Amino acid sequence: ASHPITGEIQLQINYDLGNLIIHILQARNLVPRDNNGYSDPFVKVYLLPGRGQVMVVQNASAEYKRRTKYVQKSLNPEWNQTVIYKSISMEQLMKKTLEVTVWDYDRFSSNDFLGEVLIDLSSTSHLDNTPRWYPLKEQTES
């Protein structure tokens, strides 16, 4: 079988004190799979022109997720997390692009792809902390 990459991702961007902050929220219209609810999808966000630092997103209060993971975790998973990249000025920042990538855990440990977005910080109008949706594309390997 195969799973096509679809859906989008919602996040909040904000840069302050020379530090780039990014908050993860959730994704919608993701790739459906057999047996609803089984694995908690995670995201990876790193700058293109950086040191290759991939920051994975954590899961919010499972207490509230455990009740929503039913259909959400299956089609639209959330995270509601926050990350920062200190030591980054608008000079190099504008040159860097925030790439949000969704990944699902395997049955043993591996991680499958789910979606990839590219947010150019050169014009990131969502800097003023604004929850906006971003289209998740596929990871082409030419």
Swiss-Prot record:
Ca(2+) 2 binds at residues 34, 104, 106, 112. This is Protein piccolo. The lineage of its organism: Eukaryota, Metazoa, Chordata, Craniata, Vertebrata. Expressed in brain (at protein level). Ca(2+) 1 binds at residues 34, 40, 104, 106. The modification Phosphoserine is found at residue 89. Changing residue 54 to S: Small increase in affinity for calcium. Disruption phenotype: Loss of both Bassoon/BSN and Piccolo/PCLO leads to the aberrant degradation of multiple presynaptic proteins, culminating in synapse degeneration. C2 domain 1 is involved in binding calcium and phospholipids. Calcium binds with low affinity but with high specificity and induces a large conformational change. It comes from Rattus norvegicus (Rat). Residues 5-134 form the C2 domain. Transmembrane segments: none annotated. Ca(2+) 3 binds at residues 106, 109, 112. Interacts with BSN, ERC2/CAST1, RIMS1 and UNC13A. Interacts (via C-terminus) with TRIO (via N-terminus). Interacts with CTBP1. Interacts with SIAH1; this interaction negatively regulates SIAH1 E3 ligase activity. Directly interacts with GIT1 and GIT2. It is found in: Presynaptic active zone. Scaffold protein of the presynaptic cytomatrix at the active zone (CAZ) which is the place in the synapse where neurotransmitter is released. After synthesis, participates in the formation of Golgi-derived membranous organelles termed Piccolo-Bassoon transport vesicles (PTVs) that are transported along axons to sites of nascent synaptic contacts. At the presynaptic active zone, regulates the spatial organization of synaptic vesicle cluster, the protein complexes that execute membrane fusion and compensatory endocytosis. Changing residue 55 to S: Increased affinity for calcium.
